[PDB]
Amino acid sequence: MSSTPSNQNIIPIIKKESIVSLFEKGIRQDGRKLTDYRPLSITLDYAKKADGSALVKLGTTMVLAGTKLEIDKPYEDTPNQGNLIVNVELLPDENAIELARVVDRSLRDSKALDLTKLVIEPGKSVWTVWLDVYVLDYGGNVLDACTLASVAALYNTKVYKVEQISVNKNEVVGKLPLNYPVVTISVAKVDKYLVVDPDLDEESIMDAKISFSYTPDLKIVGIQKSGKGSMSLQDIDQAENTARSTAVKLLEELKKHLGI
């Protein structure tokens, strides 16, 4: 059973109007434009005992993603594919499950990680990639941060030597079979305005948000609307235009952090 969150921090009409008044002059509380992303930090290899990891700061939102690889027999249905298992934890569920699945879908459906290249022995043994994503600081737009952390952690992942049966964890053999990074861009509808990368206050006053996932060739690769409110046909049309032109900038920035 899913139910309207009773803990939800109701934000007075007076404060919403302040924010909306700024939007009307094309500016936000923290000074950025309506289409601007917050400052982005990525620290790779943050969790030393992870196979690959990334600590992402997007504004005040902090996410730590880490990978862990294991050898498993493949699923009966898919004898020639490895596995990706995404898990999200909110520390400060349901929203956690949604986040996990949305991230998973955009990694899987985009073919960013090629699962068919995770086979060791077809039908006998394949790699399972455990991706665990920990939201440490909730500063708004957790999803985009999760995607950034996830992608970064995957790129940071070391693959080890296979003794044939056994994993030799002090001989690094290679990297994950990654085709390209992927970004998720969230656009929030607040009043009659569209805003990129909504912060905490912005998320609390928004009608709804919509998240678009892009590969570098700017193909759409996942969409998820979110929030208790609705959004018009034109809103969504504009939102993706805005999202896509933002995607280019964010991909560049992501690549810089990853060493391309």
Partner 1 sequence: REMLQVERPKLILDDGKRTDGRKPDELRSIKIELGVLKNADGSAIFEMGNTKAIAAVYGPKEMHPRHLSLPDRAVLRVRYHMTPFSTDERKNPAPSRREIELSKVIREALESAVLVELFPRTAIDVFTEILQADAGSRLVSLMAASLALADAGIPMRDLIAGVAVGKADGVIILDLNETEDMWGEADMPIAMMPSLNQVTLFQLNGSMTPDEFRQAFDLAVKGINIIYNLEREALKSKYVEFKEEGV
Q: Which residues of the shown chain bind partner 1 in the complex (CB under 8 A)? A: 1-4, 6-7, 10, 46-51, 53, 60, 62, 64, 66-68, 70, 87, 89, 91-92, 94-95, 97-98, 100-101, 105, 109-110, 130, 132, 134, 136-139, 169, 200, 208, 210, 218-237, 240-241, 244
Q: What is the DSSP letter of 124?
A: T
Q: How far is the CB of 8 from partner 1 (least distance, A)?
A: 8
Kindly tell me which of 85 and 252 has the beta carbon lying closer to partner 1. Answer: 85
Kindly tell me which of 67 and 260 has the beta carbon lying closer to partner 1. Answer: 67
Q: How far is the CB of 184 from partner 1 (least distance, A)?
A: 12
Q: How far is the CB of 25 from partner 1 (least distance, A)?
A: 26
Q: How far is the CB of 234 from partner 1 (least distance, A)?
A: 8
Do 89 and 133 touch, CB atoms closer than 8 A?
Answer: yes
Provide the token pair at 156.
Answer: 């940071």
Do 110 and 215 touch, CB atoms closer than 8 A?
Answer: yes
Kindly tell me which of 166 and 260 has the beta carbon lying closer to partner 1. Answer: 166
**CA gap 57, 45 in Å, rounded:** 14
Kindly tell me which of 115 and 221 has the beta carbon lying closer to partner 1. Answer: 221
For 20, 95, 226, 244, the CA distances from 191, given in Å and listed in that order, are 7, 24, 15, 22
**CA gap 206, 230 in Å, rounded:** 10
Q: How far is the CB of 70 from partner 1 (least distance, A)?
A: 7
Kindly tell me which of 28 and 209 has the beta carbon lying closer to partner 1. Answer: 209
Q: What is the DSSP letter of 115?
A: G
Q: How far is the CB of 50 from partner 1 (least distance, A)?
A: 4
Do 36 and 197 touch, CB atoms closer than 8 A?
Answer: yes
Q: How far is the CB of 109 from partner 1 (least distance, A)?
A: 6
Q: What is the DSSP letter of 86?
A: E
Do 87 and 194 touch, CB atoms closer than 8 A?
Answer: no
Torsion of CA 139, 140, 146, 147, to 10 degrees: -140
Kindly tell me which of 4 and 260 has the beta carbon lying closer to partner 1. Answer: 4
Kindly tell me which of 91 and 260 has the beta carbon lying closer to partner 1. Answer: 91
Provide the token pair at 259.
Answer: 């060493």
What single letter denotes the amino acid at residue 49? Answer: K
